């Protein structure tokens, strides 16, 4: 690919390199060597340097060179708990379980270790959304209580009748 195919292989090669465990940054020219992109266009060399390698959220500019961003990705149980806490504190929202799994290898160990601290919501497509378990105010009760509560239909009542009950019972 011209102006589009080369960058894809750079990202793929960089991702694979990190999986090996090489946190050391790599130069633009060095990465091009192992990606068989030595003949890349000059205008793409500056374009990747100025735009592709900085705008992407997985590229870290260290001492001029570029390195992966495992810090942003969750790679520890503590980071997993912290990320959810910030989401609840700032009200950012939940995160799909698949997103955590790819970012966190063996995410099952972290998820099970935290246990109830993570709230799981099952989407129609089996996707699980993780939410922080705010343990400030908790209230869990027996199942039949909700069943009786559900038995008390309220959507099929008017405001006048609902408010009339208050004076009917004397409260």
């Amino acid at each position: 690919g011209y102006k589009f195919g080369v960058l894809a292989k750079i990202v793929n090669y960089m991702k694979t390199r990190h999986q090996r465990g090489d946190t050391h940054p790599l130069t633009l020219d060095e990465i091009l060597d192992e990606t068989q992109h030595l003949d890349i266009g000059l205008k793409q060399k500056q374009w990747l340097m100025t735009e592709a390698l900085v705008n992407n959220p997985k590229i870290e500019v260290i001492d001029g060179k570029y390195a992966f961003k495992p810090k942003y990705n969750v790679r520890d149980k503590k980071a997993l708990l912290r990320l959810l806490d910030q989401h609840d504190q700032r009200g950012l929202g939940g995160i799909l379980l698949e997103d955590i799994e790819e970012a966190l290898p063996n995410s099952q160990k972290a998820v099970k270790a935290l246990g109830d601290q993570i709230l799981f919501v099952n989407r129609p497509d089996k996707k699980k959304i993780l939410f922080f378990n705010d343990k400030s105010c908790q209230f869990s009760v027996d199942e039949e209580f909700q069943k009786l509560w559900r038995s008390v239909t309220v959507d099929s009542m008017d405001e006048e009748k609902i408010e009339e009950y208050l004076k009917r019972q004397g409260i």
Binding site: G93, F139, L148, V152, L166
Partner: protein, 187 residues
């Protein structure tokens, strides 16, 4: 907006509703009025899921909504649903849910009395205590049913009634903590 109203709304929503309803209320607690679209982006919930939760919140009238129609910069009509919490209407509806449960004790008790004391297990037909005497044959000396020609036992009908009584006192425990919560309405 006294803090008592804000504090209770969290307590009640976290009790009879799931985390989805509580999270939506938190946004309305932070800001008096919030757009429906803004809440969707913040919570990242599905459109249908958020609408269902909002509809449920509208069912109990905890939060009211107003529709604003305006013209967008590109000329297309924009209809934004603005949601705001109505404490005055919230207190009345939540209070209504107290007396119903409080008066629900009498209604549940009547259910046990409905069950007949005497029943025939072999024919699986409830036997009235009075009708048993007429069905009872003095010559035989014990009550019996002619159609099936077998003895009757009323002990079976006794056991279900006893269990239901436990369900009643057990029911009251649920509404006991909430009684404390609703005291913040009056304050």
């Amino acid at each position: 907006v006294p803090a008592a109203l804000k504090r209770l709304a969290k307590y009640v929503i976290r009790g009879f509703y799931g985390i989805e309803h509580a999270l939506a209320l938190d946004i309305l607690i932070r800001n008096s009025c919030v757009k429906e679209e803004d809440m969707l982006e913040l919570l990242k919930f599905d459109r249908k899921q958020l609408r269902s939760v909002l509809n449920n919140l509208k069912g109990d009238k905890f939060i009211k909504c107003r529709m604003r129609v305006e013209t967008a910069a590109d000329g297309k009509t924009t209809r934004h649903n603005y949601y705001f919490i109505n404490y005055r209407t919230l207190v009345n509806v939540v209070k209504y849910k107290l007396d119903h449960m409080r008066r629900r004790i009498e209604t549940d008790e009547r259910d046990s009395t409905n069950r007949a004391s005497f029943k025939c297990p072999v024919c699986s037909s409830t036997f009235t205590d009075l009708e048993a005497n007429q069905l009872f044959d003095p010559m035989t000396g014990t009550f019996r049913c002619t159609f099936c020609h077998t003895e009757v036992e009323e002990d079976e009908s006794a056991m279900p009634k006893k269990d239901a009584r436990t369900l009643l006192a057990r029911f009251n425990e649920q509404i006991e903590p909430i009684y404390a919560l609703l005291r913040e309405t009056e304050d």
